[PDB]
């Protein structure tokens, strides 16, 4: 239909992709928003997922220590799943390299500060997956983020954030 | 700037002065006029690429005197003039810093 | 960087699976043929979420086969390569004309005029190391590139970068 | 006039910005040329060097890194040459 060309980039002026945009609806008929992730939070969500289905596997044969971590879910993943997921190997050696917090109370503060401040999600998350104490070193970094956002308020987040986070 | 402030002021036949003073701070804008600021602030942007490429220097020499948020008058002299001549009044004039958003020539560019 | 969404997907049953124990025959099925899985539309296909209560709930068998179609929705983790900012990924792999950074899961690639010229480049290192300061290519190399564009094709991901920036390449 | 120069002038402006690129790769028993990213996807496994898909031939360089300094002197001299045809169309833009 017209070929519908549509060039988009991909940024952080709320410059983002009509693929995966904000306000989707979900399969029962409500709105579906984007879900943007955190390095952080995609590190403690990985886990959570992963203890879920074991002990649902736990019951259906009955019916944050990154170095253990790492090899006992790569054990749990080659005792049902493949072995190919050398990619998914090296995305959570990703996740355990830079994310922000090691542990998980961290991040739930965070998420529980930005659930008060209702910043734009997709720009937070990116911050979030990034791992940085300097505002001013983030704006010169991505000049979206210079252009968008003021460094006093940057930083007054970025320390408020900085004083909680693991620091490596 | 050079008249004494207890002089003697006069005024002759300005009984339509209100023209004047309404077109002292009116303006009007067309299309060729856009599209004359859009081939000057290519051009300028050219000369910015330009100056940035062969000497970096005078445009971070500016780039720092805006970051101590120097002004026309601070910089300039009387022999050389201003290019934007101060559209407003003095007494409403702003004279802090520029902000680091339009502080960079590509920045303001940009802008 | 990774997403979140509701996806859906549609799967063939072959007849002699029509056994009185199928719905988790099918969430197996949904297992391995989500993890571990690349496209176009969402990228890398990272694992499985809301593992419980699934939507399958119907199937429709094909007229010419005695194959079963099922239609399968789901909520996920993916990958989207994006383009135009920093990511701090690592090196594996290096060329004569560049290094071949893995950034997780896929393998970005900076061409020789993509790395700047005054970056002091020796060909005589093992692997060729486009170093000035200190982003020399070893087993980590935390080299901070910018996806210039993750080219999108058919489902074998591939993307262009360049650390032609400051900080960029440098951490 | 004034569509023609500034077809020229879009052409060798893309032309530079082109050979700006890098040269990409050819197959000379097809006399195929190759981008850089078709070399990045007909790469062998050593991760050294890139084959030909049909004719299974290691891709060679193609040649226009040099080209880039030429095209920009040629469009240089080129806009000197054509500079009173601009002088001369500004002062038409100027008259009516």
Known sequence: RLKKVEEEENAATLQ?????????????????????????????????????????????????????????????????????????????QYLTNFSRFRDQETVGAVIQLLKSTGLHPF?????????????????????????????????????????????? | NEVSKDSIVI???????????????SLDLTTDALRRATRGANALDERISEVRKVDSQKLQDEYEKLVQGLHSADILTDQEEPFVETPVLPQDLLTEAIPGNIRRAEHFVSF | MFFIKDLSLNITLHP?????????????KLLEEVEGSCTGKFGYILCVLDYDNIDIQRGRILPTDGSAEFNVKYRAVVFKPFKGEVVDGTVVSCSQHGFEVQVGPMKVFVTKHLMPQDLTFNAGSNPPSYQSSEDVITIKSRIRVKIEGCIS??????????????????? | I????????????????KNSEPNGYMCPICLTKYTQLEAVQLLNFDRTEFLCSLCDEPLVEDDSGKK????????????????????????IDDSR
């Open chain 2, 11 to 25: 005024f002759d036949e300005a009984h339509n002065i209100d023209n004047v003073c309404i077109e002292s701070l």
């Open chain 1, 123 to 168: 720009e937070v998350a990116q911050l979030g997956s990034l791992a940085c104490d300097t505002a001013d070193e983030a704006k010169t970094l991505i000049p979206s983020l210079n252009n968008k956002i003021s460094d006093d308020e940057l930083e007054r987040i970025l320390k408020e954030l900085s004083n909680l986070e693991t620091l490596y």
């Open chain 3, 153 to 171: 094709q058919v489902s074998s991901i591939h993307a262009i970068g360049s650390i032609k920036e400051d900080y960029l390449g440098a951490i």
């Open chain 4, 2 to 17: 004034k569509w023609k120069v500034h077809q020229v002038v879009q052409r060798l402006k893309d032309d530079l910005d």
């Open chain 3, 16 to 28: 002699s699976f029509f056994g009185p124990r199928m719905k988790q025959y099918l969430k197996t």
């Open chain 1, 16 to 92: 983002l992709g009509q693929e995966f945009q904000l306000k989707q609806i979900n399969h029962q008929g409500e709105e579906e928003e984007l879900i943007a992730l955190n390095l952080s939070e995609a590190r403690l969500v990985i886990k959570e997922a992963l203890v879920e289905r074991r002990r649902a596997f736990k019951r259906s044969q009955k019916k944050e220590t990154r170095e253990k971590e790492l090899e006992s879910i790569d054990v749990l993943l080659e005792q049902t799943t493949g072995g190919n997921n050398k990619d998914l190997k090296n995305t959570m």
């Open chain 4, 68 to 91: 880039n300094k030429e095209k920009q002197d040629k469009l240089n001299r080129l806009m000197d040459q054509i500079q009173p045809i601009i002088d001369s169309l500004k002062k």
